[PDB]
Each structure stands twice: as structure tokens, then as C-alpha cells.
Amino acid sequence: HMSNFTGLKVLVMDENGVSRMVTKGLLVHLGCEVTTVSSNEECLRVVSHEHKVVFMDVCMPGVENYQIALRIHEKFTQRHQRPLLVALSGNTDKSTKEKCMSFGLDGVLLKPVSLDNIRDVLSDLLEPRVLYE
Amino acid sequence: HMSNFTGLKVLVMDENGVSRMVTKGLLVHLGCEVTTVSSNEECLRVVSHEHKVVFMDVCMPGVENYQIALRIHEKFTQRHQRPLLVALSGNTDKSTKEKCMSFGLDGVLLKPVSLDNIRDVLSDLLEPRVLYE
């Protein structure tokens, strides 16, 4: 497991201030350097290689909120690695999972979020994995 | 599942001709465009963004054969994505797994190899994955 991400450069994209604020607060308690944005256009100019992870809100109906992740893949396709994309939603049913895959999200968090679901995901995403067989 | 990788740009690095030859043959039957090399120095100059996957042999004792994967991570750290690294070994016990992780290998194949273990790995590596929670 992995309990703290002290120094983790992460970005939060959420149109809602409270949600954005809460999310930043949790990440800060875990030791993250959190940059926040509240619009897609803003997310695209701010997101840099500095950011190891981008948590984005996807609670709008359909895939309106997933487009930004595609736009984000386009951008880093400059020298540095594209950041890991994590979606923030009210569900994780097939609906959501399907969308994240086709749209490039690497992980998904169920809302409201807690240190608990945040650690697990950041741990999985950040920790070494090898597909044996 | 995923049965054919027609058009898959892959590279094979193996000092042994037969092993290198066999591996290329299997990948060609699956539809891959296989480039092969037989030395580390050679692997480093040939490996390009063209290559979506690099299968490398790691049967030397210790981690002598894993170094090339580190050297490969260094290189793409230019614009294009680093290729997925797959190790070819005679075992998959903890010994191997530990090494692949610390050295950046994304997957590992047990030798001798077969279309079977090749498909599974390429499928997992290549197919969309999302860490929900």
C-alpha cells in the first residue's frame, strides 16, 4: 500500500468550487502540491509535465466532461509524459468504466471522495505493476 | 481477448539467433512487423517510437539483461512515448517479477514462448484498463 504522496504534483479540474476545494484539501493532507482549475480551456493551458496526476470531474451527463482527457492526450503527444488522468464521478458502473477507457482515463474515483479511495487509486496508479504470464 | 495484432510494430532483442528467430516467427504469425537486434548497443540505436513493444531476453544471471530497459526509458525521456517493455525468461517467480518492476519492464513472458502467452500479454498490455474504486 501507499499512505502518503508527499510532494506529488497534481492538478484538479472541477467547475464546482466546493468540490474543487474539498478535493484539493484531501490531496493536501496526503502531501500533494495541488494546482486547481475550473474550466476546460484553463485546464489545457495549465496542465504541464509537472503534473503527475490530473483529477477531473465527470459528473456532467454523457461524455461532455471526458473530452478534456482526450484534449489532454493530444497535448502531451511534446517530449514529456502525459499525466495520469483520474475521473471524479458519482458512480463507477459500466457506464462510467466504458467512458473512461475509450477516453483515456487511467482511474476513477467515486464521489464524495475520501483519503481512502484517493490513496488506493494513487497507490495503484503510481506503484509498479508487471503483467506476468 | 485479442487474437491478432496485425500491423503491430515490435522489436525483439536477443543475443541468441534461434531464440530471436523463433520469437520473430511467432510475432509474424500474429501479424506483427518485427525488427530484431542481437546486442544492447544495437537495441539502443534501433529502438524508435515506431516500436510499440520491445521483447527483450533476460535469461542472463542477475540483472545484466534488465539494464537495457533502463537505458530504453532514458532514451524516450524525446517527444514520443517509450515502447512497452516485455521480458523473455525461463521463470516468472518473485525473482523475475521484482526485477521487472524496479527495472521498468511492463510484462514478462515465460520461455519457451507460444502464441498463447504472447497474445495474453500483448492483449493485456495493449488493451484499455481503468483502475476503478
How far apart are the CA of A99 and the nearest CA of chain B, in angstroms?
A: 10
Which residues span the domain enclosing A48?
1-133
Q: In this complex, do B130 and A102 lie within 8 Å of one another by their Cβ atoms? A: no
The residue among A2, A6, A41, A37 whose CA lies nearest residue A23 is A37
Cβ contacts (< 8 Å) between B107 and chain A: which residues? 130-133
What CATH number does the domain containing B104 carry? Answer: 3.40.50.2300
For chain B, strand residue ranges (E) read 9-13, 33-37, 53-57, 84-89, 107-110
How far apart (Å, rounded) are the C-alpha atoms in residues B75 and A50? 19
Mark B80-113 as b/e (b = at least 16 C-beta within 10 Å).
Answer: eebbbbbbbbeebeeebbebbeebbbbbbbbbeb
Solved with: X-ray
Please state whether beta strands A53-57 and A84-89 pair in parallel, antiparallel, or not at all (unpaired).
Answer: parallel
Amino acid sitting at position B42 = E
Q: In this complex, do A133 and B125 lie within 8 Å of one another by their Cβ atoms? A: no
Chains A and B: how many Cβ contacts under 8 Å? 65
Resolution reading in Å: 2.5
Q: B76: which residues sit within 8 A by CB, 6+ positions away?
A: B49, B82, B83
How far apart (Å, rounded) are the C-alpha atoms in residues B120 and B17? 24
Torsion angles phi and psi, residue A86, rounded to 5? -120, 130
Domain count, chain B: 1
